[PDB]
Write a protein that binds this ligand. Structure first.
Ligand SMILES: OC[C@H]1O[C@H](O[C@H]2[C@H](O)[C@@H](O)[C@@H](O[C@H]3[C@H](O)[C@@H](O)[C@H](O)O[C@@H]3CO)O[C@@H]2CO)[C@H](O)[C@@H](O)[C@@H]1O
Ligand SMILES: [Ca+2]
Ligand SMILES: [Ca+2]
Ligand SMILES: [Ca+2]
Ligand SMILES: [Ca+2]
Ligand SMILES: [Cl-]
Length: 771
């Protein structure tokens, strides 16, 4: 019967954890138990035993300012404040970070660290970040916020561009990164040592940077999340191609803008950018192209190891040494997007941070989700940001607010959204929407929630969709159903020759997946590919087990069927960059030309059928630009690559069609269930319960549209019958060769009869009947 741990939970409650309380009495414990302050004895008011949980609840006048208390029994233990108690005493509502005045002559600087003994700012040269220029102690307020005003006293007349860190004493000096840092010094993770473990923050004034007429998107037809066609692009990928060697630097915001007309023409409404906030593992001074085909040890990074939640990465800047440049550059890009009638969605990664020490150094036992002993819960050798905790929630909501208001960002995609409490994300949305009425938010709603050990909460995951109409979630059900997904990637599915229950395909096309309840189409982000896992092309190739050279058109015919189904489904439409042309993550490396042993290459999947270079990367976060570059020749050079450019034009046409009628962008489940019909019922003609062909009717507000998809490897008769024979009076606008809104006078891959259609194998047909 020994004292293990101790936590003060409120003004008059200390919780002492023991190994056991069996056979010991309230009277025997009151005897041995004694409480002490910062050495004096505190009057012990009462104890209550929780024998089950093996802990005493101790009552007394345990006023915080009489230091932490330490509990005696037999060994002693100093009490720690619980995160709920730290919120009670130290939750701060005011401005955080460092704020420049108009002429840069002063800075107002705040940092939250309620258990710090002292907090010194260390200031480094703007023209050389390694050189220490000045230091200043900060003054702690009532709520544990450390403040200072930088001015003439430190010998600097203009602070803009100067860098800073915070040395924090506890007992232990540790140097930390202002979590509200608005920009940073050029960052190279190879400079990390024991003393400085992070990027240095930077004195900048966002409001004075970039286009001062920046404003939110002006998207036509856009009346909600259902009207969104999202396009997921990585800033490096989009311009890392060698063929672009004919204005702005490689793989930067300024480069990205030069290829916006493409996306304007492609028809997408929103460009979703992979994490543009600062991430840890990089050398931002090395912009050189990696030309070798590899899946490890590349300066390339998707950006899923977060360093800052407010400060942009230098990697996408032309001038990474100028901390103001990022902000002006990203604003320039976002402005350029808005002029093209489109919007931005920023991928944001709050679920975890690059290194636990990033926030744990600032204030131990607070920012992260925790185990019952105070130990921080971790993910990826990184900290799990516990966003039920007030100041952790602030980091998320304030950054959302800041990015929304300062960069005129139109939406956000939350990585591993199910790691967070619903409440944090709901507030995030509410605040972001308050700034921008047209705010759109999506996220990965995988049921992954961990939280604080013994404290369950509603997570921001798929099951949350019942009880909000705010944030939408990726539909892995439609993904898995159409062409397989993690963990069982490669399994033949609807467009890869494996028969699927047509009722569940039809329900998915209505934005009603089988694995969670979507009571509004806007709850569902429909997708078949993303940056994660194999690309659409590669998964198709693997699933049908064929070589991409020989089966190219077989694979592309199947790929176009996937895009047709996503782009004519209800809910929010999502397109992975390259999915439009047939992008591949082929491992064209000599040492991997044929299968190898046990000893596999990193993050690669094998296709047997293929002889030459059989390895394809399914997790390209650490892969070269050779693996990760968007192929512009494949996407726009009709002459050189007729098959991929056909798939591209086809995908464009489908987007055009989707935007041109609200038959595919309905608002409620009520009207979807009424106006979206299943033409191919089980039994009608050749149709089995599980099958590889399906067709459905929709109606906009009164043009009827009918989408037919034969994913079978043979031709198939679709029986219209009494109910749908009226379709024959309409006209074809999508066929084997082309997609759009104009009628096709000589359609291919389909034949019409008195009351039926004979559709070619691996072919999609769409008919319009205006009225
Ligand atoms: O970070 C790990 C992976 O996270 C993502 O995978 C998701 C899947 O996309 C999602 O379908 C879900 O898969 C589980 C599935 O729903 C469940 O029924 C099955 O029994 O277990 C599956 C676990 O694989 O959740 C996972 C993550 O938990 C992401 O797609 C992938 O890239 C990541 O590697
Ligand atoms: Ca177009
Ligand atoms: Ca500089
Ligand atoms: Ca809902
Ligand atoms: Ca890397
Ligand atoms: Cl893809």
């Amino acid at each position: 019967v020994q004292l293990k741990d101790a936590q003060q939970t409120d003004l008059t409650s200390i919780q002492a954890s023991f190994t056991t309380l069996d056979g010991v009495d309230k009277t025997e414990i009151l005897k041995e138990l004694k409480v002490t302050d910062k050495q004096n004895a505190i009057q012990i008011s009462d104890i209550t035993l929780d024998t089950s949980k093996s802990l005493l609840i101790i009552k007394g006048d345990f006023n915080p300012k009489q230091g932490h208390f330490n509990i005696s029994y037999n060994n002693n233990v100093t009490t720690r404040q619980s995160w709920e108690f730290k919120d009670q005493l130290y939750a701060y509502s005011g401005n955080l970070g460092a704020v420049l005045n108009q002429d840069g002559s002063k800075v107002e600087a705040s940092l939250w660290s309620p258990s710090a003994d002292s907090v010194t700012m260390i200031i480094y040269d703007k023209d050389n970040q390694n050189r220490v220029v000045a230091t200043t102690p900060l003054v702690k307020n009532n709520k544990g916020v450390w403040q200072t005003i930088l001015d003439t006293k430190l010998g600097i007349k203009n602070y803009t561009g100067y860098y800073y860190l915070y040395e924090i004493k506890r007992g232990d000096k540790v140097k930390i990164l202002d979590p509200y840092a608005k920009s940073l010094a050029e960052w190279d993770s190879n400079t990390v040592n024991d003393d400085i473990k992070t990027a240095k923050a930077a004195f900048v004034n966002p409001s004075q940077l970039g286009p001062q007429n920046l404003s939110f998107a002006k998207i036509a037809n856009f009346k909600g999340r259902q009207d969104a066609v999202i396009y997921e692009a990585h800033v490096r990928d989009f311009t890392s191609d060698q063929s672009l060697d004919g204005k702005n630097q490689l793989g930067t915001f300024a480069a990205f803008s030069e290829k916006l007309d493409y996306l304007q023409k492609l028809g997408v409404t929103h460009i979703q950018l992979l994490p543009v906030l600062s991430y840890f593992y990089v050398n931002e001074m090395d912009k050189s192209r990696s030309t070798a085909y590899t899946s490890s040890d590349n300066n390339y990074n998707w950006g899923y190891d977060p360093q800052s939640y407010f400060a942009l990465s230098g990697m996408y800047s032309e001038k990474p040494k100028d901390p103001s440049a990022r902000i002006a550059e990203l604003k320039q890009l976002i402005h350029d997007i808005h002029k093209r009638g489109m919007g931005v969605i920023l991928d944001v990664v709050y679920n975890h941070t690059a290194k636990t020490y990033l926030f744990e150094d600032i204030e131990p036992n607070y920012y992260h989700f925790m185990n019952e002993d105070g130990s921080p819960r971790e993910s990826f050798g990184g900290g799990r940001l516990g966003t039920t905790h007030a100041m952790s929630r602030r980091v998320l909501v304030d950054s959302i607010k800041y990015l929304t208001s300062e960069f005129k960002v139109d939406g956000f995609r939350f990585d591993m959204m199910g790691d967070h409490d619903a409440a944090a994300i709901e507030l995030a949305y509410k605040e972001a929407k308050a700034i921008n009425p047209n705010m759109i938010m999506i996220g990965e709603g995988w049921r992954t929630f961990q939280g604080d050990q013994g404290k369950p909460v509603k997570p921001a995951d798929q099951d949350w969709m019942k009880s909000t109409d705010t944030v939408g979630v990726f539909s892995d059900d439609i993904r898995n159903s159409l062409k397989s997904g993690f963990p069982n990637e490669g399994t033949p599915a609807f467009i890869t020759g494996g028969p699927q229950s047509l009722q569940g395909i039809f329900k998915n096309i209505k934005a009603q997946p089988g694995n969670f309840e979507a009571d509004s189409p806007g709850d569902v982000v429909q997708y078949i590919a993303a940056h994660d896992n194999l690309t659409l092309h590669d998964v198709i190739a693997k699933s049908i087990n064929k070589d991409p050279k020989v089966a190219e058109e077989d694979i592309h015919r199947r790929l176009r069927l996937g895009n047709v189904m996503i782009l004519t489904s209800q809910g929010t439409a999502f397109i992975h960059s390259g999915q439009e042309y047939g992008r591949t993550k082929r491992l064209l490396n000599p040492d991997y030309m044929t299968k190898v042993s046990d000893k596999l290459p990193n993050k690669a999947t094998l296709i047997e059928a293929v002889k030459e270079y059989p390895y394809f990367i399914h997790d390209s976060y650490d892969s070269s630009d050779a693996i990760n570059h968007f192929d512009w020749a494949a996407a726009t050079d009709n002459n050189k690559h007729p098959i991929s450019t056909k798939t591209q034009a086809y995908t464009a046409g489908l987007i055009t069609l989707r935007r041109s009628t609200d038959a595919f962008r309905k608002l409620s489940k009520a009207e979807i269930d009424r106006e979206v019909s299943l033409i191919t019922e089980v039994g009608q003609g050749d149709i089995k319960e599980k099958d590889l062909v399906i067709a459905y009717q929709t109606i906009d507000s009164g043009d009827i549209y009918a989408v037919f998809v034969n994913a079978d490897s043979k031709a198939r008769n679709v029986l219209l019958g009494e109910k749908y024979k009226h379709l024959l009076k309409g006209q074809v606008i999508v066929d084997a060769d082309q997609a759009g809104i104009k009628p096709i006078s000589t359609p291919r891959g389909v034949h019409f009869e008195k009351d039926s259609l004979l559709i070619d194998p691996l072919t999609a047909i769409v008919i319009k009947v205006g009225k």
